[PDB]
Amino acid sequence: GHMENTVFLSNRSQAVRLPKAVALPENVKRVEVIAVGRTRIITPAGETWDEWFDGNSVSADFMDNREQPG
Amino acid sequence: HMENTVFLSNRSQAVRLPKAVALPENVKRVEVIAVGRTRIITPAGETWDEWFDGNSVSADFMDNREQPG
Amino acid sequence: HMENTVFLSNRSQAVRLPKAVALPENVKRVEVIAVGRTRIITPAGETWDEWFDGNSVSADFMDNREQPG
Amino acid sequence: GHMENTVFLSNRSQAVRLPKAVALPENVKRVEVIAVGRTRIITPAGETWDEWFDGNSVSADFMDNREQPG
Amino acid sequence: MLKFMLDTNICIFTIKNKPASVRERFNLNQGRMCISSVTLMEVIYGAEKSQMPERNLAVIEGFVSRIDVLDYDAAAATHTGQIRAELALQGRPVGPFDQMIAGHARSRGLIIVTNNTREFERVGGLRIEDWS
Amino acid sequence: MLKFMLDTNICIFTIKNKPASVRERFNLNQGRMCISSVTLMEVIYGAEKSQMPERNLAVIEGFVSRIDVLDYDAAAATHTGQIRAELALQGRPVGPFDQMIAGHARSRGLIIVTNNTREFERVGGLRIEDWS
Amino acid sequence: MLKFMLDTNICIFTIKNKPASVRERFNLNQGRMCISSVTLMEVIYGAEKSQMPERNLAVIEGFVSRIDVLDYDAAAATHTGQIRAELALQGRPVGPFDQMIAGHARSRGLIIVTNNTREFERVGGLRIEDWS
Amino acid sequence: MLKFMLDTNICIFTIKNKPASVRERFNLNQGRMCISSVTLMEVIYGAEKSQMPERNLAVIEGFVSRIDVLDYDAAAATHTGQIRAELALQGRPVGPFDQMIAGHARSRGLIIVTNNTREFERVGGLRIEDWS
């Protein structure tokens, strides 16, 4: 996970290039930033299980007729 | 709390960092560490502060290393 | 039978090929295939001749594919 | 295993660059060439088991006192 | 590091029923969990054959994007072949997708999580867990 | 540069029988041919269930080393989920492996190369070729 | 493709006794065989502690250079940790090097070849074979 | 750029207790530190045998993600084979893991960083440092 870098400033803020050795899933397009000390922690936005469990559900016809041949 | 957007920059992923959670001006170099889908952004030379101050192991952890000898 | 030496060329491994086992002059391009520690050197476009003419599978081999259906 | 190339001639013979995708063990420094049709097959020199089994043996003090702690 | 490969059976079970007992294992092992792309194929099929595909697809997407999805690659394929033969020569029956999931996990040393333990217990050299 | 995906049926057909008409086709289309991991799963199985596995495995290795093996990825799994439902609407049967091979081809825009087109004709939007 | 990981026990057994029954398995599975670098450490020690190290080293080198030697990497290390704990919590004893070899093989799905089957049978999700 | 290899003892010591004097040392020597796969095997074990593994595994991940993990390669295995014999000549004991950690360091010319030098002093030709 180790990899060093330099912070460059954007048009509105500071930004950080994530070198390949460290880069996030390209699947991730939104991120939450948490400030802890002089350190910043970024996390993929909305990925705890509790949101999904309490959130939207499938229709009751998405069923267990799994249709694995036999 | 403070959500954000992911940039693509220098053929790599990048991160807008809004003012409310900005790094101090004392910092120009950053060590970035990968754990799961999370990345830790520490000032170079303050790399370990987040881990020392952060969570810790349970009290039972490795009470002996159990190397034969 | 005919042993040989391994060269290091073009930052890569290479192979002296003595006269006794030389490729025909009809050949300038070569397909090279890797199987275990062995490499097969075929004229491009004659890539499969060594495999078709070479060893074969036992007669019991895949008498049915046993895909459910 | 697929990878195409061009045969170049050395000071004494024809030679073939082995691109990285195909390259032999760097451990291998001698090779046997077998001619089959218009195809050449190269093999690491002296690596069948029968040579080793029939060949040199260890001194009778290289023993089963394996000394795995316990 | 990844550690667990989720069976298609348990995935269906949780997407449907969202039981708190799996929610707890999910919260504990978040980041240590994956599915075979074989399983991804199955749920996309259930969603595309539902009446409300875009809805169920979206719930499918929500579940999968908290997952690491592994491609069914050559290692996985080869281990599946050995499994299909190891089972055949012992006469033990296991479904085709389940065979490909078992092989995928064995190929990478992952623990399979399933509630169809009986079928997956028939596979050799494979650690099995039931989170339901 | 890739263009053709050899399904399992052509692979057996070639491996078991080595037809001369196939050799020319392969020699001539070298570099544009590939198989799915799913097809690999099956030939490895045939070797491993056979009465001389180490021999048949070696024959496999030489075949597969000449072509590319493509991982059955999320894209293949998506397209297969669509196809499996497409077949539910058309009401025509297809074997499991074969529908994954189809989805894989459609996902990468490759021509199915087979010896038994009659199965692959039922699924939509694929270039199919018979090399038998 | 690799398939088998040779225990240190069987390696010692064959280097010493060169039995024809292993010679046959060696000739059949040549190219499908490897050892953990853990094992490489052990035999180099036996050679360096012998009276004729350069001789036994050379016989060691002859055996190893027909082998693929795998580095004991992070995957192997992690699986060993799980094994040491899986065994401890069941009270089953297995030697330290043997634990690292088992984990190395399990980490890559390899079949362990050993004549100390009793110890290695105590490890979970690991296929075991005896070639002696 | 690498210079120091943290043995297992310093790793536990740090992970279990997080001493302030170690934090400065680590902060200051970031980028020049690494561990052996062998040490990784052991901390993973400690997590996995503990009564809260998923928690302790997460603490491990953050530690290890900050440093390099070096594979125990043929070079480490060679040097360990020499050391194990070197200790037989000197007649002084050393634990298994520890002698592999030593060999690994000597093989790569790295300074052992420890809290208990008394074990590592017995083996020849190593720079040793106490960071406790």
Author numbering:
A (entry chain D), D (entry chain D): -1 to 68
B (entry chain B), C (entry chain B): 0, 1G, 2 to 68
E (entry chain C), F (entry chain A), G (entry chain C), H (entry chain A): 1 to 132
Paper passage:
VapBC TA systems are the most common Type II TA system in bacteria, and consist of a VapB antitoxin and VapC PIN domain-containing toxin. The VapB antitoxin consists of two domains, an N-terminal promoter-binding domain and a C-terminal, intrinsically disordered region, which conceals and inhibits the active site of the VapC toxin in the VapBC complex. Like many Type II TA systems, vapBC expression is auto-regulated at the transcriptional level through direct binding of the higher-order TA complex to two operator sites (OS1 and OS2) in its promoter. The related vapBC locus on the chromosomally integrated Escherichia coli F plasmid is mutated in bacteria that are tolerant to beta-lactam antibiotics, before subsequently evolving resistance.
To investigate the structural consequences of the vapB tolerance mutations, we used X-ray crystallography to determine structures of several VapB variants in complex with VapC. Moreover, the structures of VapBT3NC (2.6 Å), VapBT3N+A13P+L16RC (2.8 Å), and VapBV5EC (3.2 Å) revealed complexes that are virtually identical to the wild-type complex. This demonstrates that the overall architecture and integrity of the VapBC hetero-octamer are unaffected by the tolerance mutations. However, we noticed that the DNA-binding domain of VapB appears to be quite flexible and with low local resolution, which means that side chains are not visible in the regions containing the mutations. Of these, Thr3 is close to DNA backbone and could interact directly by hydrogen bonding; substitution to Asn could therefore potentially affect this interaction due to its longer aliphatic side chain. Interestingly, plasmid loss assays show that all substitutions that cause antibiotic tolerance also reduce plasmid loss compared with VapBQ12C (all P < 0.0001). Plasmid loss assays demonstrate that reduced plasmid loss conferred by VapBT3N, VapBT3N+L7P, VapBV5E, VapBL7P, and VapBQ12L is Lon-dependent, similar to VapBL12 and VapBA12.
